[PDB]
């Protein structure tokens, strides 16, 4: 009947969340990664700072 019109419509509808939600997931995992380089810049190495300053 409608040939490829419904194909285009429905397939793009599935696209618009299949790829978009994964893209948002990647953005927020990179945000967690952002916070985590902040954490490791001040968690392990900062424990070593307290150690070396106590040594001094």
């Amino acid at each position: 009947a409608l040939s490829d019109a419904d194909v285009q419509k429905q397939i793009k509808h599935m696209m618009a969340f299949i790829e978009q939600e994964a893209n948002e997931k990647a953005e927020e995992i990179d945000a967690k990664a952002e916070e985590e380089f902040n954490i490791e810049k001040g968690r392990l190495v900062q424990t070593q700072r307290l150690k070396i300053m106590e040594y001094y």
Partner: protein
């Protein structure tokens, strides 16, 4: 959409899996960056403390 767009959906989900996997690889990359960069900052601060200690001596 017997085969036209369902294959496109499969490809999009494969792209999603690859993107999240590479985002986790970038997490590992930047975690190692934090390790290294902060350690060099520690080396610099240690040099500063050495200087102040020689002054105190």
């Amino acid at each position: 959409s017997q085969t036209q767009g369902i294959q496109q959906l499969l490809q999009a989900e494969k792209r999603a899996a690859e993107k999240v996997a590479d985002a986790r690889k970038r997490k590992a990359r930047r975690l190692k960056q934090a390790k290294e960069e902060a350690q060099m900052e520690v080396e610099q601060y240690r040099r500063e403390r050495e200087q102040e200690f020689q002054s105190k001596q």
